[PDB]
Design a protein around this ligand. Structure first.
Ligand SMILES: N[C@H](COc1cncc(-c2ccc3cnccc3c2)c1)CC1C=Nc2ccccc21
Lengths: 20, 336
């Protein structure tokens, strides 16, 4: 399930902003 | 609405043109604990000794701000923050600087981040998400009305106050601009196609962000995710989105129009502006006026264990606050 794929991904924690 | 905005514009303008400066001092605050950290700064719960109040003090390291070339962005944040005023924006109470750092003291929101509550709960029902999304809708109408683009909408930047309402934080990328801008800024999952393609963009990227937020709140995961940014950018531009089976037909309709790669059709960027959003089926039950006044029942109340309680925030390693004997970046931050 997508839920499973998400939870198993490395992007479930606080996501940092980008710019450079 | 036009009435309220008109006067809101007049107040912002006076402050914008004459920003307040050095309204406090570091030694008037008691350092309690770190509530969060960023590339060039940190935010701590503080206690104002003269008033006995708690605040969230954002400490920025001038040298790091310069190394990361965020000088103008940091000036944008404080100048804008000291001038705006809306019920869903956290208030900047005081601002000052010393030899080593810049400081922005905001009102403390004990409730914690939507991120934390969202991840723990999984996903919010549709009325729950509609209640928060509505608040973002009025906040963006407000900001854009003032020619401000926010550029960093995400659960990590949304707090839940004592009344269950949202409080937006982090104006590090906010900017007053009429016309196009090109700064590549934001968070991978929330970036609009225009940004990733480097094509000059406007307020419409905020509306696309809203589309990402609503989807994440209602689904439990973002519409575009992968373990590395480039993969996430590949999905965003493809103009291809998938919706959970439980998403209502109206919810999927509102998102199709929000997550529109063609910013000529994207809701919010049309001739009818924000109204194309406020008048969408999914918001028929929404009393926009009621939400602004906060007389609408909140679906969740993060009751706290007293003032100065940081129970709803995660722990972070404490960093000692040192201030060099010499001024580090005077010229660069003179207007702060
Ligand atoms: N984007 C994250 C949170 O960003 C904030 C930025 N500024 C103010 C608050 C902010 C504002 C008001 C608050 C009221 N109560 C509790 C917490 C609060 C946090 C939060 C991380 C991040 C990115 N850059 C940063 C720089 C410094 C600290 C953290 C980050």
């Amino acid at each position: 399930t997508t839920y499973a794929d998400f939870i198993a991904s490395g992007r479930t924690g606080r996501r940092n902003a980008i710019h450079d | 609405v036009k009435e309220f905005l008109a006067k809101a514009k007049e107040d912002f303008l006076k402050k914008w043109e004459n920003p307040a400066q050095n309204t406090a001092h570091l030694d008037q605050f008691e350092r309690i604990k770190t509530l969060g950290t960023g590339s060039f700064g940190r935010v701590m719960l503080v206690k104002h000794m003269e008033t006995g109040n708690h605040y969230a003090m954002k400490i920025l390291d001038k040298q790091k701000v310069v190394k990361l070339k965020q000088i103008e962005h940091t000036l944008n944040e404080k100048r804008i923050l000291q001038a705006v005023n809306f019920p869903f924006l956290v208030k900047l109470e005081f601002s000052f600087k010393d030899n080593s750092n810049l400081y922005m003291v905001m009102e403390y929101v004990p409730g914690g981040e939507m991120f934390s509550h969202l991840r723990r709960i999984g996903r919010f029902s549709e009325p729950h998400a509609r209640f928060y999304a509505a608040q973002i809708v009025l906040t963006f109408e407000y900001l854009h009305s003032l020619d401000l683009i926010y550029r960093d909408l995400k659960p990590e930047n949304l707090l839940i106050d004592q009344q269950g309402y949202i409080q937006v934080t982090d104006f590090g990328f906010a900017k007053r601009v009429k016309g196009r801008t090109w700064t590549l800024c934001g968070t991978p999952e929330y970036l609009a196609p225009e940004i990733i393609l480097s094509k000059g963009y406007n307020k419409a990227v905020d509306w696309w962000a809203l589309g990402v937020l609503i989807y994440e709140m209602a689904a439990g995961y973002p519409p575009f995710f992968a373990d590395q940014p480039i993969q996430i950018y590949e999905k965003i531009v493809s103009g291809k989105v998938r919706f959970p089976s439980h998403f209502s037909s109206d919810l999927k309709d509102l998102l199709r129009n929000l997550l529109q790669v063609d910013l000529t059709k994207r809701f919010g960027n049309l001739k009818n502006g924000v109204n194309d959003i406020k008048n969408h089926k999914w918001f028929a039950t929404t009393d926009w006026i009621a939400i602004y006044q906060r007389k609408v029942e909140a679906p969740f109340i993060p009751k706290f264990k007293g003032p100065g309680d940081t129970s709803n925030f995660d722990d972070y390693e404490e960093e000692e606050i040192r201030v060099s004997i010499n001024e580090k970046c005077g010229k660069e931050f003179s207007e702060f």
